[PDB]
């Protein structure tokens, strides 16, 4: 069970955000920017985008004005807003297009990447999730898994700091489907 061992050890890399000062600062900065922002925008392509949507939905559940770029009712990016980009290689052209346009409005851009590609040049804060890849866990597979877990841990930390319960989520959760 080589693949399960790789995934298990990849999740352990997230311990740095609680024990090491340089990584704790990245987590603290991400949370501080989320609380101070007027509106929060999330973007990613493919599987990185689906993981991005999971986080966007959860931020909305907590009461933030959260949006995913590309969707129906997503408005204009303004000066007091925040953009969070999720990309494996950090080289995806569609992610760079969104980064360039946001850069003309403000500097509040965060990049969650595996490899430090071109997108980091446009980011104010870069959060690298350097995970182990495998033959049977190709492309950004392990990054997408670890990024989802990291983003759920950010939600966990936001709930702790603002004293939010599960009741806040039920109140704002979709009830039509």
Curated annotation (Swiss-Prot):
General function of this protein: Catalyzes the isomerization between 3-hexulose 6-phosphate and fructose 6-phosphate.
InterPro entries in alphabetical order: PHI/rmpB (IPR017552), SIS_dom (IPR001347), SIS_dom_sf (IPR046348)
Functional pathway: Carbohydrate biosynthesis; D-ribose 5-phosphate biosynthesis
Amino-acid positions noted as binding substrate in the UniProt annotation, renumbered to this chain: 48, 87-92
Segments forming domain SIS: 30-164
UniProt keyword annotation of Protein biosynthesis present: no
EC code: 5.3.1.27
Enzymatic class: isomerase
Subunit structure: Homotetramer.
Name this polypeptide is given: 3-hexulose-6-phosphate isomerase
Annotated NCBIfam families: RuMP_HxlB
CDD domains per the UniProt record, alphabetical: SIS_PHI
Family (UniProt): Belongs to the SIS family. PHI subfamily.
Superkingdom in the source lineage: Archaea
Active-site residue numbers: 144
Any one GO molecular function term: carbohydrate derivative binding
